[PDB]
């Protein structure tokens, strides 16, 4: 095997920036190197082969260089659809090794989240548990603080968050925060509130409902 080492492991750049990513081979591989872009939930997709040949249909902004043990992938003008993980791969010999990737994150202007709240469904309550969902949609940067309040009491230890990958067109994120309670615990209170703090908001936004309205 030939060990492929990539640098940096992560980078953050703005649309229009010139980006370079390097790949080092543990021993010479001549020009037998391919580059791929992997977008979320997708297989890697070929960009370059033979260190510098552009695969048909790949945008002209991508280019590759190097020989032997040191290789570089250049994106001349970074676009929102360029976010993802980039991998180099040697094909000089077994085991046709890939590097550990360079994660490319897109930077953009601050975008405040739009906040939505969902009470539990009547169907779920029938089954004995209440899931309350708070959605923070299409915001930037990813850092956001969500606090749950039930009858104004601050909650702790009964919620989970999930954040999406960056959007391929507008580079924003979305986030869900789900509060889970038993039907008995849910029926003990009235006011269910989701409080959101984010750089794009002048002051925290609260979305709330009263159990039954």
């Amino acid at each position: 095997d030939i060990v492929m080492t990539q640098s940096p492991s992560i980078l953050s750049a703005s649309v229009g920036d010139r980006v370079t990513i390097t790949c080092r081979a543990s021993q010479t591989i001549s020009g037998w190197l391919a580059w791929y872009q992997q977008k979320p939930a997708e297989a890697p997709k070929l960009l370059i082969y033979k260190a510098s040949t552009l695969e048909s249909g790949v945008p002209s902004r991508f280019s590759g260089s190097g020989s032997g043990t040191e290789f570089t992938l250049t994106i001349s003008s970074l676009q929102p659809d360029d976010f993802g993980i980039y991998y180099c791969q040697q094909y000089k010999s077994y085991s046709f090794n890939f590097g550990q990737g360079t994660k490319v994150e897109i930077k953009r202007t601050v975008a405040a989240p739009s906040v939505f709240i969902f009470p539990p469904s009547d169907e779920q309550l029938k089954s004995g548990t209440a899931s309350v969902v708070c959605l923070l949609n299409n915001f930037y940067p990813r850092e956001a603080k969500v606090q749950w309040k039930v009858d104004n009491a601050l909650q702790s230890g009964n919620s989970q968050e999930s954040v999406t990958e960056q959007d391929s067109k507008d580079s924003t994120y979305s986030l869900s925060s789900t509060l889970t309670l038993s039907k008995a615990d849910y029926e003990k209170h009235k006011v269910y509130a989701c409080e959101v703090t984010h750089q794009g908001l002048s002051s925290p936004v609260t979305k709330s409902f009263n159990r039954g309205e």
Binding site: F116, P119, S131, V133, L135, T178, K207, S208, F209
Partner: peptide, 25 residues
């Protein structure tokens, strides 16, 4: 999974936009 609706209401709008969904638990 159990699938529950995330039903749109007066509490899931932002201006002219409504959000809705499904919870897959």
């Amino acid at each position: 999974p159990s699938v529950f609706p995330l039903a749109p209401s007066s509490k899931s709008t932002s201006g002219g936009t409504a959000a809705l969904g499904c919870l897959v638990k």
